[PDB]
Amino acid sequence: NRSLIVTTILEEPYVLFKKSDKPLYGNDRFEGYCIDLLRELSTILGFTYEIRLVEDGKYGAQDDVNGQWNGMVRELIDHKADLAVAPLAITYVREKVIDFSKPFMTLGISILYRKGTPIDSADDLAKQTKIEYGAVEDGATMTFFKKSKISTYDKMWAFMSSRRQSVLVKSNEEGIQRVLTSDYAFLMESTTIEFVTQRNCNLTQIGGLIDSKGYGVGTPMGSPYRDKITIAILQLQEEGKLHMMKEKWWR
């Protein structure tokens, strides 16, 4: 039973490089909610593993031209990883190419912006073009807008799409820092927004949740690990361990 290769992505407080005065090795080099989850999965299900950072640095989306997937989703498809343990949104389009365990966390797309402004909803952003807004490129949020038939969101996509290179960022961190330096609103997941606004009193969520989804462990389609992982996650859920992990990393 060789070690499983687990792909993930850097995103506070789910996954981050662990800091230490002394050299760190193997699994100890990383820490976070998803890293704790991965550890619990490994002992409950009995497996060793190597943590690999998704090489192209993306979550996963289908290319508009050739329809090929990228990010963690593509690494699973190509069997370059056995599992993807990260804040990976369970979506319909992704379920068509990879499998997901049951959710270990629920969330929804929302807006991150500076406080003190009259912007109070997605509509308030969509009805104007002065304040720019975006999302991380090749992520579930972007895909949500790209596929939305809801007028407000569809026009928001038209906006983002027409200014793609300027408003779609390489990482959520890049979008957050931007909201802090320029007149920019950032579309990202509520769980993360909670973490960010907790540590930046100048930031706030705008409006409520635009949708409802969950984070799940991804596996190559047909993987025998998916159902086992679901059993482990549901067990961690019932015992209140997932709640304890959330409190630990969010506070």
Ligand X SMILES: N[C@@H](Cn1oc(=O)[nH]c1=O)C(=O)O
Is residue 94 part of an annotated ligand binding site? Answer: yes
Query: Applying CB under 6 A, does 140 fall inside the site for ligand X?
Result: yes
> Using CB under 5 A, which of 7, 8, 27, 110 touches Cl ion?
27
> Using CB under 6 A, which of 32, 103, 134, 139 touches ligand X?
139
Hey, CA dihedral for 21, 33, 242, 236, is it positive or negative? negative
Measured CA to CA, the distance from residue 223 to residue 213 in angstroms comes to: 22
> Using CB under 8 A, which of 37, 81, 107, 142 touches a copy of itself?
107
Query: Applying CB under 6 A, does 70 fall inside the site for ligand X?
Result: no
Tell me the window of 48-56, 139-147, 171-179, 242-250 that interacts with Cl ion (CB under 5 A). 48-56
Query: Applying CB under 8 A, does 237 fall inside the site for a copy of itself?
Result: yes
What CA–CA distances, in Å, run from 33 to 36, 118, 151?
Answer: 5, 34, 36
User: Starting from the edge strand earliest in sequence, which strands make up the sheet with 98-100, in order?
Assistant: 49-53, 4-8, 83-84, 218-220, 98-100
Structure-block tokens of residue 77:
């498809």
Query: Applying CB under 6 A, does 188 fall inside the site for ligand X?
Result: yes
Query: Applying CB under 6 A, does 122 fall inside the site for ligand X?
Result: no
Smaller CB separation from a copy of itself, 57 or 108: 108
Tell me the window of 78-86, 131-139, 173-181, 231-239 that interacts with a copy of itself (CB under 8 A). 231-239
Smaller CB separation from ligand X, 49 or 59: 59
Measured CA to CA, the distance from residue 170 to residue 164 in angstroms comes to: 11
Residue 182 binds what, of a copy of itself, ligand X, Cl ion, none (CB under 5 to 8 Å, by partner type)?
none
Smaller CB separation from ligand X, 118 or 242: 242
Burial 108-131 (b: 16+ CB within 10 A, else e): ebbbbbbeeeebeebebbbeeeee
- The DSSP symbol for 205 reads E
Query: Applying CB under 5 A, does 240 fall inside the site for Cl ion?
Result: no
Q: Hey, which residues between 31 and 90 contact a copy of itself (CB under 8 A)?
A: 65-66, 77
- Give me the residue label for tokens 């498809």: 77
By beta-carbon distance, which residue lies closest to ligand X?
139
Measured CA to CA, the distance from residue 1 to residue 4 in angstroms comes to: 9
Q: Which amino acid is at 178?
A: R
Q: Which amino acid is at 105?
A: M
Measured CA to CA, the distance from residue 73 to residue 216 in angstroms comes to: 12
Query: Applying CB under 8 A, does 227 fall inside the site for a copy of itself?
Result: no
Tell me the window of 32-40, 43-51, 110-118, 131-139 that interacts with a copy of itself (CB under 8 A). 110-118
> Using CB under 6 A, which of 62, 141, 219, 223 touches ligand X?
141
Question: What is the binding site for ligand X (CB under 6 A)?
Answer: 59, 87-89, 135-136, 139-142, 172, 188-189, 192
